[PDB]
Curated annotation (Swiss-Prot), chain A:
Class of the enzyme per the UniProt entry, highest EC level: translocase
Location(s), subcellular: Mitochondrion inner membrane
Known EC number: 7.1.1.2
GO terms, molecular function: 4 iron, 4 sulfur cluster binding; FMN binding; metal ion binding; NAD binding; NADH dehydrogenase (ubiquinone) activity
Subunit field text: Complex I is composed of at least 49 different subunits. This is a component of the flavoprotein-sulfur (FP) fragment of the enzyme.
Source organism: Arabidopsis thaliana
Cofactor: FMN; [4Fe-4S] cluster
PANTHER family: NADH DEHYDROGENASE [UBIQUINONE] FLAVOPROTEIN 1, MITOCHONDRIAL, NADH-UBIQUINONE OXIDOREDUCTASE FLAVOPROTEIN 1 NDUFV1
Protein name as annotated: NADH dehydrogenase [ubiquinone] flavoprotein 1, mitochondrial
Positions contributing to NADH binding: G60, R61, G62, G63, A64, G65, F66, P67, S68, G69
Protein residues bound to FMN: 172-220
UniProt keywords, alphabetically: 4Fe-4S, Electron transport, Flavoprotein, FMN, Iron, Iron-sulfur, Membrane, Metal-binding, Mitochondrion, Mitochondrion inner membrane, NAD, Oxidoreductase, Respiratory chain, Transit peptide, Translocase, Transport, Ubiquinone
Note describing how the cofactor binds: Binds 1 FMN.
Curated annotation (Swiss-Prot), chain D:
Superkingdom of origin organism: Eukaryota
GO BP term, pick one: cold acclimation
Keywords: Electron transport, Membrane, Mitochondrion, Mitochondrion inner membrane, Respiratory chain, Transit peptide, Transport
Keyword Methyltransferase: no
Gene Ontology terms, MF aspect: cobalt ion binding; NADH dehydrogenase (ubiquinone) activity
Entry's localization field: Mitochondrion inner membrane
Name of the protein in its database record: NADH dehydrogenase [ubiquinone] iron-sulfur protein 4, mitochondrial
Functional description taken from the UniProt entry: Accessory subunit of the mitochondrial membrane respiratory chain NADH dehydrogenase (Complex I), that is believed not to be involved in catalysis. Complex I functions in the transfer of electrons from NADH to the respiratory chain. The immediate electron acceptor for the enzyme is believed to be ubiquinone.
GO cellular component: mitochondrial inner membrane; mitochondrion; plastid
Family of the protein in this entry: Belongs to the complex I NDUFS4 subunit family.
Topological type in the membrane: Peripheral membrane protein
Residues making up the signal peptide according to the UniProt record: none
Curated annotation (Swiss-Prot), chain G:
Source organism of this protein record: Arabidopsis thaliana (Mouse-ear cress)
UniProt subcellular location: Mitochondrion
Catalytic activities: a ubiquinone + NADH + 5 H(+)(in) = a ubiquinol + NAD(+) + 4 H(+)(out)
Subunit field text: Complex I is composed of at least 49 different subunits. This is a component of the iron-sulfur (IP) fragment of the enzyme.
This protein's UniProt keywords: 4Fe-4S, Electron transport, Iron, Iron-sulfur, Metal-binding, Mitochondrion, NAD, Oxidoreductase, Repeat, Respiratory chain, Transit peptide, Translocase, Transport, Ubiquinone
Protein name: NADH dehydrogenase [ubiquinone] iron-sulfur protein 8-A, mitochondrial
Lineage, opening ranks: Eukaryota, Viridiplantae, Streptophyta, Embryophyta, Tracheophyta
Curated annotation (Swiss-Prot), chain H:
Portion of the full sequence shown: 57 to 300 of 748
Organism: Arabidopsis thaliana (Mouse-ear cress)
Chain residues that bind [4Fe-4S] cluster 1: H110, C114, C117, C123
Name of protein: NADH dehydrogenase [ubiquinone] iron-sulfur protein 1, mitochondrial
Complex and partners: Complex I is composed of at least 49 different subunits. This is a component of the iron-sulfur (IP) fragment of the enzyme.
Chain sites annotated for binding [4Fe-4S] cluster 2: C162, C165, C168, C212
UniProt-annotated location(s): Mitochondrion inner membrane
Top-level taxonomy: Eukaryota, Viridiplantae, Streptophyta, Embryophyta, Tracheophyta
Residues reported to bind [2Fe-2S] cluster: C50, C61, C64, C78
Domain named 4Fe-4S His(Cys)3-ligated-type: residues: 94-133
Cysteines paired by S-S bonds: none
Function: Core subunit of the mitochondrial membrane respiratory chain NADH dehydrogenase (Complex I) that is believed to belong to the minimal assembly required for catalysis. Complex I functions in the transfer of electrons from NADH to the respiratory chain. The immediate electron acceptor for the enzyme is believed to be ubiquinone. This is the largest subunit of complex I and it is a component of the iron-sulfur (IP) fragment of the enzyme. It may form part of the active site crevice where NADH is oxidized.
Amino acid sequence: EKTHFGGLKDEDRIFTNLYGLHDPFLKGAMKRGDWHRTKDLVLKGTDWIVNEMKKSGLRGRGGAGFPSGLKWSFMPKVSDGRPSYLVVNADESEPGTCKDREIMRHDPHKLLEGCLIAGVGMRASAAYIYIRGEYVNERLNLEKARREAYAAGLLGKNACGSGYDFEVYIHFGAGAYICGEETALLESLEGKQGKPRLKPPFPANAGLYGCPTTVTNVETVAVSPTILRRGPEWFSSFGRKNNAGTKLFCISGHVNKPCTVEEEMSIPLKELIERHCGGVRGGWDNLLAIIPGGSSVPLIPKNICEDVLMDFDALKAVQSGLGTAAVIVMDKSTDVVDAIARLSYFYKHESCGQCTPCREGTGWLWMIMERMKVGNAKLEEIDMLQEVTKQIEGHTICALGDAAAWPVQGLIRHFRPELERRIRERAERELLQA
Amino acid sequence: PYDVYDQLDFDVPVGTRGDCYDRYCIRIEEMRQSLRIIVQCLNQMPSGMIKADDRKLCPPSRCRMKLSMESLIHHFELY
Amino acid sequence: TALNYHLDSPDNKPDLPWEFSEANQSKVKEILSYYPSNYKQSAVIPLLDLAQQQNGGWLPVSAMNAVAKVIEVAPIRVYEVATFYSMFNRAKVGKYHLLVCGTTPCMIRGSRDIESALLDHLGVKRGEVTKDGLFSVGEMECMGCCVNAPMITVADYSNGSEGYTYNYFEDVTPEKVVEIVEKLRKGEKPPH
Amino acid sequence: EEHLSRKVIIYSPARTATQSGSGKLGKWKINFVSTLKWENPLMGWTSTGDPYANVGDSALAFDSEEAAKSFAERHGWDYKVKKPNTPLLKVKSYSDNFKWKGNPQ
Amino acid sequence: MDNQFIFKYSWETLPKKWVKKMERSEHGNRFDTNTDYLFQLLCFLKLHTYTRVQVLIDICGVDYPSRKRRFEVVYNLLSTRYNSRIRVQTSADEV
Amino acid sequence: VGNHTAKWMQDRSKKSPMELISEVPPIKVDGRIVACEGDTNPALGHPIEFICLDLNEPAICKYCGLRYVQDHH
Amino acid sequence: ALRRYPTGEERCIACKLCEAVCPAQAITIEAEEREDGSRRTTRYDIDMTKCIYCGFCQEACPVDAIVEGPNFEFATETHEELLYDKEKLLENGDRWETEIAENLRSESLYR
Amino acid sequence: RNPVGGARVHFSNPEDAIEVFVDGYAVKVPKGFTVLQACEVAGVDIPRFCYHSRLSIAGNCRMCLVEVEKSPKPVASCAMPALPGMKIKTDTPIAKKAREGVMEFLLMNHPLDCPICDQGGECDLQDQSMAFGSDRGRFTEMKRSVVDKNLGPLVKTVMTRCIQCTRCVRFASEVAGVQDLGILGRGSGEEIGTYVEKLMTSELSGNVIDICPVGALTSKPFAFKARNWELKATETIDVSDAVG
Ligand SMILES: Cc1cc2nc3c(=O)[nH]c(=O)nc-3n(C[C@H](O)[C@H](O)[C@H](O)COP(=O)(O)O)c2cc1C
Ligand code: SF4
Ligand code: SF4
Ligand code: SF4
Ligand code: SF4
Ligand code: SF4
Ligand code: FES
Ligand code: FES
Ligand SMILES: [Zn+2]
């Protein structure tokens, strides 16, 4: 309700095959409700689909949370000769996230019908599904579902008997985290190195092959048909205002029972962990720090986690983000400084190397963080560490550079005494030993 | 005044006749006043840098020039 | 020991002939059919993956030159792609590439307890193939969240492109990893 | 007298190609074309007997084309003026990197 | 007698046609004058009670080849009475 | 003995500096990178130079001519 | 004097900083790639009759190659003996190396 | 104000022109000019490394950052198109701080080679460090190092100096028409090279020496022979063919 959020029922769940108990193929998908009367939805026209998306309040599920309907409306109404492309981002290489993998594993037909619904809502003639390279088994599942849809007439020429021709193809990456970035995905799909582009141009004006293009997450695309069929007002009824709908959640780390669950948006973080995942290993008092969604947002401490809600606006106000809704939980036994230094290694390793502050700064951050892990640093280096993060942030081509500075900035902001102590203990050991 | 001459005590001898003998006595008295100043400089000599810190006008130390890119660039430019 | 350049060797040099097999020409044609005919370069990644599967799990420089010919680009543009992405092996690996020693999410649950036992049973160091040419150990790249598994990866290049599998194994222990190696040696696909 | 009948070139030196910075242009020089130098047969040092060996590049300078011309004509030198080349700024777009190739022919 | 007082008092008392340029700066108070007035300006400054510029420190020339009057002649002067310095400059050519 | 040295060295009793630095054996390093300062006291040497040892052939310091190699591989 | 490394290699790498800073223009340098690829002078002349013995060259050198040593007793009978070439300078370095090195150790705490 | 370098600006039509402000001053530029080109018309010299007027825009060095009103982030002027009413600031504390931070990152792994480097004395990196980033260096860790590459008898290579601007790669593809140079690898370990051992055969290959802003690509026959301050410059024409 309007007061409290959580406790989503089975009847409001969109992904009705999340645990893989039923058949994910065409017979089972039609049994669950997929490809049901799809012809009439597309005969309502592009303008109606975009309007329903706008009214549903759906926001981008890829981390940025941009409103989905406004983003589809960016596509041109009249073609200037160039075709229009829809690109589905199934390249989730962010540590701790598997929501898109589970969608491609147990509801591929939701993705395929979402691909067609989105394509009509974008006036796009073809769609490309960029899957992660190591999702080999998932891709083979998707290709089988795609072959099923083509034979049944649901995809291809005269899709579902409506006269709208729509091709769906499948592409896969080769193991690069940066290729999940929307412009880097476009470059990788063009057969080049996965290096992000500058903006402008924006993809809706010059994207794939220089043609108008929209890149959207698997989750965002896979929920459009259920929103269309059940209506935007049902979807907007969940969550707070501007944070509408339902979210796929995955909670890992120091919890009694980790699991991936579908839950109402803006659910309290504490309620989420205690209701679906038992609780912090050792009780809620044992909690030390939580990473709300994905390793690309800053951590929050125990006092902030007590009443922060799992939505875009709530986590923004405490200097964090919803991200991919990949909840990583750390109890008091974790070495937080080691955990952050381990993330700093990941961003140095995953940097595409194109632009100077990220290419050179990510390595510098990792080197300092490895030194601070054992206290082999001066107390004034913590301030210097803070300033190097500020030199990276806002000065890079893409948002990986910001995502590299945020975990370090959060550590200093919330656990500076721990770093200061490690420096003190090392200095005390240095004085007595020699 | 310039440098630290305002923090130092010394007399300015002047003549009364303006001939060669006054100028001889003044130069003698000026060496006694120079001796007086040197003593005060010796006693008031503080610790610190002997070169202006700005890094556009003063050479870096040899160790800095051989260890830091910025210092080497400045040394190359300065010389 | 991955390097951003190539040094000529008897089994890896540009004058060695290399082309897609006749049973692979059909796959090559259908891969190219997904993209506009004047945008063939979009096929570089799936074609490099298919070349890797045909050639036993690694890409000699001749294989890269062969893909560059199909997509009609200069070979340097293919070298850029093969060196940028980490799934491409530019040095020889065994018939079964074992990928271990994960990243951040699995080290918290003690992931660095599987590698040393693997090299000790296999009798090689990381990066070099065994004498019989069956097994090599490589750096795994991780997905997911590492909740219920110090995990390992197995790439099966022992049956070319028509028997290639890329599977992840859960709950792997210094014992269980060996059980995988022995079933892999005997030909049985280990359960995952 | 003797050094007042030499012919000079008045020109504005262009930008060096080894640097992208434009901070040395706008100056106007008087080139005395001092090309009479040889090697001293003791140490291999470069010798000259021409007094205007470097004054045209080291000391004399002018802020305008007219100033250099006026100075040359007052001294009686015969001058030729070489007008400097300038770049033409053209419309450049980053979006051009991703221009559509058109339909396959 | 600071440079603030000299600049203001010279503006009020000097005949206007003598000085064409007045620069007040921490580098030095400077009075640019035409050549036909240089002698009279220097006699005023020497004899006037409120200036008493009794010492001529030196005279130097500067060459400006890009100028119609290429030579600048600079008179550095000193008042021991008021502990102040003044710079008086004028331009000249070759003839 | 070479042409570069013969421009200035007119005495053949001692070896040229190019000969002398060639006789110093390459230094084995455990790792792929080594920093050379040209002296035990860094202030008395040359500006610090980081040298990569990925190539089989020994790597030369561009300031002092010392050669380095990877010890194991 | 011109100095060597303890291996016998020359310290000078022909940066030409000393030539540029020299107030008397007493230094002349020619250089080219050596047969082993090293950046070395083929000519290094100091005109001892133009030099003002200021020490600016020793300050400018980044590798401690050129130094003003402690010898002051080198009067000659001819002007040409005071035109020092590269080999004479390196001979001076060999003769005075023990004293020069000790002096540099002494003065390394001030520069 | 005189455009930078005295550069000429051509207008197809006076109607096809827009007004932008560069440090308060008002300039008129053709439609389609970038922020950097507007700054040149204003006579303001923006520091740059990856940008070359005769090559496609790359926007990777991040040295051309300026402040744009109502823009939340510093703006790469080389790539950003100019818009009517745009207020461009180049000397603000945000722009100055961005330049110092980027110059710090550029020199982090750069080798202490100015004495042995032929670019010394005519080096954009040297001049911009003296001007824009007047940072006392605080990087104390180990620098990365790169092995040199063989590109033939004309282009000598010292790749530790490379700042990965990709001017050489873009020149090879766009101007020379011979695609031999690429950027291999990923991250701080990316290296400019040909991957396989091959020499630069294009008849315009030597031009990569001029466009390389650092001493990574230099003329092998000119190596170590002279410093730029001791060379007399003469402007003349070439007689090797009938082009002049
Ligand atoms: C380093 C990086 C990695 C990213 N990875 C993904 C990803 O794996 N999946 C995804 O949907 N978006 C990813 N994004 C966000 C995309 O740039 C883009 O905003 C998103 O795919 C749009 O999807 P949406 O609007 O439907 O949420 C990534 C962004 C960055 C900077
Ligand atoms: S910020 Fe990092 S990942 Fe993004 S373009 Fe720059 S170097 Fe590449
Ligand atoms: S001492 Fe050295 S720097 Fe000074 S004038 Fe003599 S040669 Fe030149
Ligand atoms: S003596 Fe020193 S300063 Fe002079 S050229 Fe040699 S290395 Fe450079
Ligand atoms: S390119 Fe050469 S001259 Fe320029 S900063 Fe680097 S080492 Fe010094
Ligand atoms: S070699 Fe030179 S031009 Fe090429 S990327 Fe490196 S710095 Fe740029
Ligand atoms: S052990 Fe966790 S991904 Fe490899
Ligand atoms: S000059 Fe604009 S980013 Fe390199
Ligand atoms: Zn050395």
